[PDB]
Amino acid sequence: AAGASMQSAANITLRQILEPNNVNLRSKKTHIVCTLGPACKSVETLVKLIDAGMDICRFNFSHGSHEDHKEMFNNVLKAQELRPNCLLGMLLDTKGPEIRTGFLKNKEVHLKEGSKLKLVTDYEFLGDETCIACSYKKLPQSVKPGNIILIADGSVSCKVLETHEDHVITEVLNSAVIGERKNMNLPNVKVDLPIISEKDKNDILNFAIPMGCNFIAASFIQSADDVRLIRNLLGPRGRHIKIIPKIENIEGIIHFDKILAESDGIMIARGDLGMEISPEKVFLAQKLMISKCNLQGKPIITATQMLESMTKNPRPTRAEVTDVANAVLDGTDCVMLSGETAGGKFPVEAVTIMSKICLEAEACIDYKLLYQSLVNAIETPISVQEAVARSAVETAESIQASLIIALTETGYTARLIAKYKPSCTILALSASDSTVKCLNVHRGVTCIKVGSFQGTDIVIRNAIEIAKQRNMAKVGDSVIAIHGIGTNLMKVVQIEL
Amino acid sequence: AAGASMQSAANITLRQILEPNNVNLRSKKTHIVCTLGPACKSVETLVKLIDAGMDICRFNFSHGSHEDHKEMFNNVLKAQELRPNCLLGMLLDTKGPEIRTGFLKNKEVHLKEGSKLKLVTDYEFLGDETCIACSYKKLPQSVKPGNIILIADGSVSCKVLETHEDHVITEVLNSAVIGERKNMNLPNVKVDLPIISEKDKNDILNFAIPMGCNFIAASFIQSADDVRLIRNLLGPRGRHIKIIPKIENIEGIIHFDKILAESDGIMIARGDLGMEISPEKVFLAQKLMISKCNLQGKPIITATQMLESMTKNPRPTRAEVTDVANAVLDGTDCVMLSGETAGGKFPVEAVTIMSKICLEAEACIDYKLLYQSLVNAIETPISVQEAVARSAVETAESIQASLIIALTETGYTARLIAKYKPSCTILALSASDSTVKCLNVHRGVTCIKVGSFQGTDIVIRNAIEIAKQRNMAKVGDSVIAIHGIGTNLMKVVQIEL
Amino acid sequence: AAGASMQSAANITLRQILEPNNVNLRSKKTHIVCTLGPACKSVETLVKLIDAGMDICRFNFSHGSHEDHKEMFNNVLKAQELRPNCLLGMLLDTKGPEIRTGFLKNKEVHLKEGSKLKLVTDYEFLGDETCIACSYKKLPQSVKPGNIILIADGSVSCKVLETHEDHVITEVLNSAVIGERKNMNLPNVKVDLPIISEKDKNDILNFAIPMGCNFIAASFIQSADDVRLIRNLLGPRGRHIKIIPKIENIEGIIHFDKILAESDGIMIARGDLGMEISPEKVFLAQKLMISKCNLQGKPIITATQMLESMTKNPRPTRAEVTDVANAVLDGTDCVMLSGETAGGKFPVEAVTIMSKICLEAEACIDYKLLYQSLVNAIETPISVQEAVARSAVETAESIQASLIIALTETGYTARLIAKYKPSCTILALSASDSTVKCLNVHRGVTCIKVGSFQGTDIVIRNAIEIAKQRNMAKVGDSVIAIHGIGTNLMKVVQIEL
Amino acid sequence: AAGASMQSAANITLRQILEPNNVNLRSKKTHIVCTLGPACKSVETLVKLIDAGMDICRFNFSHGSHEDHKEMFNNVLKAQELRPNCLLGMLLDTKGPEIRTGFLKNKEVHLKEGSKLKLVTDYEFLGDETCIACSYKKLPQSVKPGNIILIADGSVSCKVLETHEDHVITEVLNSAVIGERKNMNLPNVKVDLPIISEKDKNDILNFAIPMGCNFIAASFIQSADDVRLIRNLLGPRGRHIKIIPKIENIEGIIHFDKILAESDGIMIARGDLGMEISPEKVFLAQKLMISKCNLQGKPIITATQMLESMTKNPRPTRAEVTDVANAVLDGTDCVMLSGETAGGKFPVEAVTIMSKICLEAEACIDYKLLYQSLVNAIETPISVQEAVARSAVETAESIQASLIIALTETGYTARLIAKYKPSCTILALSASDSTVKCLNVHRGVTCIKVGSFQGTDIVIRNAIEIAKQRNMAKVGDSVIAIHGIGTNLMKVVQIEL
Ligand SMILES: [K+]
Ligand SMILES: [K+]
Ligand SMILES: [K+]
Ligand SMILES: [K+]
Ligand SMILES: [Mg+2]
Ligand SMILES: [Mg+2]
Ligand SMILES: [Mg+2]
Ligand SMILES: [Mg+2]
């Protein structure tokens, strides 16, 4: 419940402001999660997204049937075949628990500020301006007098006056018009609904596991026990699938340290979170959560409305540009697009400008000062493995190495290096198909699948050759190689011939 | 052309995320410039804006007659009378030089990507999809082949192919529909139009000076000579009016150091600036300009689209919230609202949430580390005056003083203190009506008018009494008093009785 | 029991190594305590000592009658009359408790390593190589088997084998010859003898108080209660006399924090201390005690064998030069001469080279880094008085002020400034005769007596005039003035006319 | 001509002051050069010196025949045979150029202050109190009026009044008695005598090279060309012999940077240097030279009068203790004993206490802060080799490794590690007999001879086994291994079985 959030020290020159950036968009360090939807169902669009900087594909299971998502998944596989050097991570976002209003007698009601509104748990009641149903049966046992209830993306706020067994009575706090089946939020209240419904269970056990998804973004995580429940559900079958809790309400913030301990990474669901804490507090939660994830070496995705005005316009606002840029400078591993790619009119443009902003933000980071801030903020007894990973980053910066090459079966070594944020690419070499796609969630890590049961030096030399072929390294460069993470080893190789 | 931009180190606690802020909105340090328009012409609205955190009123002279602005000005004076403790600064924003397209034969044209378009300097030609007039007579002598011309808020880009004496021939780079008399931008080209037209001259000499405006925001400043031209035009009559250059294009960025040297402060016109440099570079210019202004002790206003989605919605996006917050953490003195207050549907809501975001951002600043970053970055031989101002800030932080009280005729002393960013309010005491309204542009400075020819100790004691009455200080607090800025003096007073 | 001892960061140039220092020896910051003796009983010698840098005169009451010391004291007063601008502090060093061997049948004994030696408490027994008397009657109750007893300046060590009621039996650990009535030490044993004997009581009540001594250096302080006993003995009559405990054994080191809390300053009796802890540990105790005294703002005197080889030679060894220099860089307020001035053949030469070494050491101190080390190491809530004293030092360094002028009745203000180690002289102005001589123990403080019941500005202006006359300041210099230490005040004055 | 000399930050606890140190004296990091003489000609004494901490044997060729030194050398070899794990470096100190007075008619003269003295170049003239011969034939062409001439260890100073072709006329500046053939010094004058005389040539070519000496300490180096002359004289035959210039006068200080560039290390001849610069300046030259050698990674020996009072007493003074201790904290690689071991009465005691002081000083060094001071002070583009050596030191500190094992043919790798001052021992493994004895001059490096043409892993494993047998490492320890210094490699090994 305390974080000394420190920005990456920035160095900004006139040259960077004035000279065009002409580097490959996939050379960026920050990775992009793209939500798939009708606006990018074509294989042609998906290849264009790949070329624009897409690294992780998000399947939002709040909507759509398994066949709708399976058809999208298969078109992703074809795009993957035409871009075999750009291995994409596959992320399933659970629908999770929802609270909705009921139906209305005349399809719409005009709630008046000052008036009073009854919220009943009989979801079959046709509502009017005086009384509306709520799908959350335990609403009356969850809210207390004085609690605030938000309806329809927070367009209406209601103050709980009385609670009874099958209904609650509120005061409407502002006037607004609302329709049927609108979302509801219960700020500062723990929601007593299953983190994983049978619907969610089916999506995980019969889509995520069989289709080979790499991440589960678990909507509305409120406790470390929610994470353990999902881990147990995945079982040995899904044990290589990473669980990424979505922090969406005050419970998730209160228990963040313990949620993060059980997790493989975090997604900041900023939109939903702004309907539980006040909007002006969301930037504080973003910066605190990013800083805590940085300190633990756990990857974090910043999500929701980073380029929202791009759902219609081909260029973003000045605020959205700094939002993406500052999330990078804050220390995020990934940034996210939702409607900008799933349904908007400029999906390729959105990913393209997002990649360009990331490149500009990354270019101004002071990496020697970033490194020292991390080193000074981490507990003093570190493991041998972490100290060697640390020395790879240090050494690379001191000699201006073009690559750190990490040989890693589980990904552990590459994650330890990524924790210390080197200015050069981390090239992770793994014989695990899972590891090679799971490491995408970490800033600055690119992976190559290699064969099992190979000599370490053969693998490193093969990797250096591939790196040359991909213009990731050239003759006369130094590269760091780290492996064995009992002998943990750091070596420096000059690229010759 | 080099700035080691460093964020204010932030400290974020769970308490700040979760507990409501219940302090007066006018207690914030960051000041708000509000653009006046039809959406806030009522005296009732203007008083509501004052209470919501408005500190400087912007009169945008791009539109409106002197009588339209004079009627607004007089309604401001009445609002000022009902809020006599909230002295507002008055800012005139010059129309300045503009470039517009001409008229169209059928009111609209559909420009097709790949096609070619002739831009003529005969502003009387009725245009079609092949040929359109431009109001800038020296366009052909200003652009060269390869230059890019933006039309209609950058919705169309054109590449200059040929230049001739009275026209230019371009290639349309993307398809779009455009109307009549649309704005144009000439990225990376110096615009050879008068910084101050006879229209601008009339507004300055016959509105700003007579009506008693405190700032001129000079649109489209491209050089230090533009500033000197305006200073000379103001003459001895307007010598107390501060000139705030608006940085809007690449010329302004290239010559920023010399523009800043001649200026009293800077406004970042981010919207217009994003149509001259690439959008993804605007955040770099913002952070560089804020950091350079901080280092010089010159005040800076961050302007354009900070809460743009609020022109229609009563709540902002997640990106706009971080934009306002990060501009504060960047080190801006003021933030600005344009259409959000002049024409939008939620002017009071916009100022209100802007003030709340500022309060949240200011609360997480680490002030001891902010101070040390400034001290370490400033040239080593400082004046006696600056060293005493420095010691007031240091001393206040060390004893947790509630106020620094600065007695200052010109404002110079208060500006030196503001340069070092104390965590407590700076209460500037001046017998100058001009100084008392001009200091509003500096973060954290509040002013009180006092009588001339008074003993220093009488003034300080009167100020402490007024501070108690305004709940800015209480019995048992320490306050710093600084004056004489040859004997420069810092004293610490405990509040008793 | 923990100190992060940090040297003053040093800056050493070739110019300082090669160019002669031609400044007044009394301009140094480090002050010199000189032990008075037959080698400097002449008024002519004492004036020469003053001119060579003597600041405090030590009267060692281990030897001499009151008339011997009174005759010396009166000759000091005459030297003082011929140097009226060089006010000297007067320090009485108590004989305190001693432990001595007894008499010997044939005046000498040869103790053989491995043999055994009986130490009896009948001080009348004439001793031989097998059995020698000890003046400490409770020796057998103080030492335990395994304790080490040192005899004759540590030339013989003995291991306690058995203890009985009136004697102890030891093993001689090395061979040596010893005479009669030699000193003894009991390492790691608390000595149960009165801190103040009737002899010491007489010297304090009938010499120190009547003659107007400014300091009592209390030999062999072992506890905070020893200090309180001396404070009570001084009573209201001697309440302005400062108590300077001499740390001489392990008890004093163990209880150092609590001894320092009750004290006005510390003297490191390094010679005696090296006969209680191992010689190779004395430098650790020196650096720890100096650093703890620096942190508390209490003055410390480093004493014993700093220029010992000068008792006979006119030039010191390379080790003695670094010893004086490093004690300065360690942070000592004063350095001390004992036999080098009281009995040696080169008293004037010794003080002269000591002053020169101090000047060289002080010149290489990095004062901005010294200040920051102190500031970073002191508890975060400081008083108003300390913060203003701090700001005087800061401000002086930033503007290169030639003087900090402190108006102070008790000396408190001047001590707070001295704690932060300014590079310029601290000129303390006091109407107290006691304060004006007591502040001599603080590095870098020079005092001027002023009249009582004077306006502050009259006093400061008079002080500036005197400073000009003494070439401590010149026209065009800045000086800091601090007083009122409820209004505490710091002012900067430029010297004109 | 500028060094920001910074002490090693020290941490001093009560435990270190009070608890005895019971570790092996040869476990210290600082190495001891012992001057061999009649006081330690016995093989029994030399073995005792080894056990007390002697690391380098100094043969002072200012005195003695080749047979005298050869007999000593052979007795060293026998002591070496009885201590085969303690490989000693062999250092030849050249007589070099000397200036002496002539003979006297009555064996002694009493020079009177104020009188005048003629110094003639006819070395055959029998001198009196008015006229004395000088062995330096070019004296009159080297000194100018105003130069100071020192005679007989600086006991007499003379001011040059006139120079003529075969004599100089001086004024005696102080009275003293002098004998025949006394040393002379010419402060601030370059001495035009051969750095290497035929006598010195014979000692180098017919003792140092044939007997296998590892270092030449070249007395009275005044320029980089002196070093190059010695390097050329050594030729390919002596190319593995390190040249250690002795800095002894102002010329050596002025040209120190260029002398150091050509050198393998530095010896500070403090005694002789105090007769060329003022005594109070010698500590400045010591700290500057140590700091410059630290920054370059060149080893430095601090020499002369560190424990001088031990030539007669069995315990040192308080000043000599801090002198040894502060030279360690200053950053010296070696400390030196001259008469304390060659002729004194307590040679074993002197080395013993010197080792103990070194241990105490080394124990209080803050190594993380020492490392950061070095890293921050070294030029930013370092080699791959230096960055890997750096990472070994970093990694060792972070995991608390017990050893850094460096495989090195030339010693280069071990010197790069030693430059960064690890808190653990550096165990250098070399197949070079020369390297294994030359690395002794570097603080904290211990060597083991290994066979040529061995696999790296076999060597490291053999070294770990030997380290266990010598109690330098135990099961459960981590050790760093570094080799290959194109692939430079750092590995961490845990000690098992
Ligand atoms: K979802
Ligand atoms: K305008
Ligand atoms: K005494
Ligand atoms: K020699
Ligand atoms: Mg949600
Ligand atoms: Mg514009
Ligand atoms: Mg004593
Ligand atoms: Mg010599």
PDB file of N, CA and C in Angstrom, chain C residues 344-381:
ATOM      1  N   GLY C 344      58.764  19.845  25.417  1.00  0.00           N
ATOM      2  CA  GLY C 344      59.651  19.609  24.289  1.00  0.00           C
ATOM      3  C   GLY C 344      60.615  20.740  23.985  1.00  0.00           C
ATOM      4  N   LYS C 345      61.474  20.549  22.985  1.00  0.00           N
ATOM      5  CA  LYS C 345      62.447  21.573  22.638  1.00  0.00           C
ATOM      6  C   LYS C 345      61.986  22.483  21.509  1.00  0.00           C
ATOM      7  N   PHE C 346      60.853  22.186  20.875  1.00  0.00           N
ATOM      8  CA  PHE C 346      60.352  22.976  19.749  1.00  0.00           C
ATOM      9  C   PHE C 346      58.861  23.260  19.907  1.00  0.00           C
ATOM     10  N   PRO C 347      58.467  24.002  20.947  1.00  0.00           N
ATOM     11  CA  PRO C 347      57.030  24.271  21.120  1.00  0.00           C
ATOM     12  C   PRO C 347      56.455  25.171  20.041  1.00  0.00           C
ATOM     13  N   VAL C 348      57.156  26.249  19.675  1.00  0.00           N
ATOM     14  CA  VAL C 348      56.644  27.151  18.647  1.00  0.00           C
ATOM     15  C   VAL C 348      56.614  26.455  17.294  1.00  0.00           C
ATOM     16  N   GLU C 349      57.665  25.692  16.975  1.00  0.00           N
ATOM     17  CA  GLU C 349      57.696  24.953  15.720  1.00  0.00           C
ATOM     18  C   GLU C 349      56.536  23.972  15.629  1.00  0.00           C
ATOM     19  N   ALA C 350      56.192  23.325  16.743  1.00  0.00           N
ATOM     20  CA  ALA C 350      55.141  22.309  16.721  1.00  0.00           C
ATOM     21  C   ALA C 350      53.786  22.922  16.395  1.00  0.00           C
ATOM     22  N   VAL C 351      53.391  23.947  17.149  1.00  0.00           N
ATOM     23  CA  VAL C 351      52.148  24.657  16.863  1.00  0.00           C
ATOM     24  C   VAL C 351      52.157  25.193  15.440  1.00  0.00           C
ATOM     25  N   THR C 352      53.304  25.714  14.992  1.00  0.00           N
ATOM     26  CA  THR C 352      53.384  26.300  13.658  1.00  0.00           C
ATOM     27  C   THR C 352      53.084  25.267  12.579  1.00  0.00           C
ATOM     28  N   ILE C 353      53.756  24.112  12.628  1.00  0.00           N
ATOM     29  CA  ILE C 353      53.507  23.112  11.596  1.00  0.00           C
ATOM     30  C   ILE C 353      52.112  22.517  11.755  1.00  0.00           C
ATOM     31  N   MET C 354      51.612  22.421  12.989  1.00  0.00           N
ATOM     32  CA  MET C 354      50.261  21.910  13.177  1.00  0.00           C
ATOM     33  C   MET C 354      49.246  22.808  12.480  1.00  0.00           C
ATOM     34  N   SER C 355      49.360  24.125  12.687  1.00  0.00           N
ATOM     35  CA  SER C 355      48.504  25.077  11.983  1.00  0.00           C
ATOM     36  C   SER C 355      48.625  24.933  10.469  1.00  0.00           C
ATOM     37  N   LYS C 356      49.852  24.788   9.958  1.00  0.00           N
ATOM     38  CA  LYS C 356      50.040  24.668   8.513  1.00  0.00           C
ATOM     39  C   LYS C 356      49.384  23.403   7.964  1.00  0.00           C
ATOM     40  N   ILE C 357      49.515  22.275   8.677  1.00  0.00           N
ATOM     41  CA  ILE C 357      48.861  21.043   8.234  1.00  0.00           C
ATOM     42  C   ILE C 357      47.353  21.229   8.212  1.00  0.00           C
ATOM     43  N   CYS C 358      46.807  21.843   9.267  1.00  0.00           N
ATOM     44  CA  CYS C 358      45.372  22.085   9.320  1.00  0.00           C
ATOM     45  C   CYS C 358      44.922  22.893   8.114  1.00  0.00           C
ATOM     46  N   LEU C 359      45.647  23.980   7.811  1.00  0.00           N
ATOM     47  CA  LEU C 359      45.322  24.796   6.644  1.00  0.00           C
ATOM     48  C   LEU C 359      45.319  23.961   5.369  1.00  0.00           C
ATOM     49  N   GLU C 360      46.327  23.105   5.190  1.00  0.00           N
ATOM     50  CA  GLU C 360      46.378  22.299   3.971  1.00  0.00           C
ATOM     51  C   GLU C 360      45.213  21.322   3.915  1.00  0.00           C
ATOM     52  N   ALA C 361      44.898  20.675   5.044  1.00  0.00           N
ATOM     53  CA  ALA C 361      43.782  19.730   5.074  1.00  0.00           C
ATOM     54  C   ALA C 361      42.455  20.427   4.808  1.00  0.00           C
ATOM     55  N   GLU C 362      42.233  21.576   5.455  1.00  0.00           N
ATOM     56  CA  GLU C 362      40.986  22.314   5.281  1.00  0.00           C
ATOM     57  C   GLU C 362      40.805  22.780   3.845  1.00  0.00           C
ATOM     58  N   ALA C 363      41.902  23.126   3.174  1.00  0.00           N
ATOM     59  CA  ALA C 363      41.808  23.651   1.818  1.00  0.00           C
ATOM     60  C   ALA C 363      41.320  22.594   0.830  1.00  0.00           C
ATOM     61  N   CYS C 364      41.546  21.316   1.108  1.00  0.00           N
ATOM     62  CA  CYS C 364      41.143  20.295   0.150  1.00  0.00           C
ATOM     63  C   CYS C 364      39.760  19.716   0.436  1.00  0.00           C
ATOM     64  N   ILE C 365      39.105  20.123   1.527  1.00  0.00           N
ATOM     65  CA  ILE C 365      37.756  19.644   1.811  1.00  0.00           C
ATOM     66  C   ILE C 365      36.794  20.106   0.726  1.00  0.00           C
ATOM     67  N   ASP C 366      35.966  19.181   0.233  1.00  0.00           N
ATOM     68  CA  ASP C 366      34.830  19.527  -0.618  1.00  0.00           C
ATOM     69  C   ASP C 366      33.652  19.861   0.289  1.00  0.00           C
ATOM     70  N   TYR C 367      33.300  21.146   0.361  1.00  0.00           N
ATOM     71  CA  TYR C 367      32.331  21.592   1.354  1.00  0.00           C
ATOM     72  C   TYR C 367      30.889  21.355   0.920  1.00  0.00           C
ATOM     73  N   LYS C 368      30.591  21.430  -0.380  1.00  0.00           N
ATOM     74  CA  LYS C 368      29.235  21.114  -0.821  1.00  0.00           C
ATOM     75  C   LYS C 368      28.901  19.649  -0.562  1.00  0.00           C
ATOM     76  N   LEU C 369      29.867  18.752  -0.771  1.00  0.00           N
ATOM     77  CA  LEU C 369      29.652  17.340  -0.473  1.00  0.00           C
ATOM     78  C   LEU C 369      29.687  17.053   1.025  1.00  0.00           C
ATOM     79  N   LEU C 370      30.509  17.781   1.785  1.00  0.00           N
ATOM     80  CA  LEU C 370      30.491  17.628   3.237  1.00  0.00           C
ATOM     81  C   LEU C 370      29.124  18.004   3.793  1.00  0.00           C
ATOM     82  N   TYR C 371      28.586  19.133   3.332  1.00  0.00           N
ATOM     83  CA  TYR C 371      27.279  19.590   3.782  1.00  0.00           C
ATOM     84  C   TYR C 371      26.204  18.555   3.478  1.00  0.00           C
ATOM     85  N   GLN C 372      26.187  18.038   2.247  1.00  0.00           N
ATOM     86  CA  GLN C 372      25.154  17.076   1.874  1.00  0.00           C
ATOM     87  C   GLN C 372      25.258  15.786   2.679  1.00  0.00           C
ATOM     88  N   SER C 373      26.471  15.373   3.044  1.00  0.00           N
ATOM     89  CA  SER C 373      26.610  14.184   3.880  1.00  0.00           C
ATOM     90  C   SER C 373      26.013  14.411   5.263  1.00  0.00           C
ATOM     91  N   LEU C 374      26.226  15.596   5.839  1.00  0.00           N
ATOM     92  CA  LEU C 374      25.630  15.899   7.135  1.00  0.00           C
ATOM     93  C   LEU C 374      24.112  15.962   7.035  1.00  0.00           C
ATOM     94  N   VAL C 375      23.601  16.677   6.028  1.00  0.00           N
ATOM     95  CA  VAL C 375      22.159  16.852   5.874  1.00  0.00           C
ATOM     96  C   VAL C 375      21.469  15.505   5.695  1.00  0.00           C
ATOM     97  N   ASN C 376      22.058  14.621   4.889  1.00  0.00           N
ATOM     98  CA  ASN C 376      21.441  13.327   4.626  1.00  0.00           C
ATOM     99  C   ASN C 376      21.497  12.397   5.828  1.00  0.00           C
ATOM    100  N   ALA C 377      22.376  12.662   6.793  1.00  0.00           N
ATOM    101  CA  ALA C 377      22.569  11.770   7.929  1.00  0.00           C
ATOM    102  C   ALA C 377      21.865  12.233   9.201  1.00  0.00           C
ATOM    103  N   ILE C 378      21.169  13.369   9.175  1.00  0.00           N
ATOM    104  CA  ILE C 378      20.529  13.925  10.366  1.00  0.00           C
ATOM    105  C   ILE C 378      19.028  13.674  10.295  1.00  0.00           C
ATOM    106  N   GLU C 379      18.438  13.332  11.446  1.00  0.00           N
ATOM    107  CA  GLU C 379      17.010  13.053  11.572  1.00  0.00           C
ATOM    108  C   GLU C 379      16.168  14.132  10.893  1.00  0.00           C
ATOM    109  N   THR C 380      15.036  13.714  10.310  1.00  0.00           N
ATOM    110  CA  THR C 380      14.301  14.556   9.366  1.00  0.00           C
ATOM    111  C   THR C 380      13.525  15.707  10.016  1.00  0.00           C
ATOM    112  N   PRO C 381      12.915  15.552  11.221  1.00  0.00           N
ATOM    113  CA  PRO C 381      12.325  16.736  11.862  1.00  0.00           C
ATOM    114  C   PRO C 381      13.345  17.520  12.677  1.00  0.00           C
TER     115      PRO C 381
END
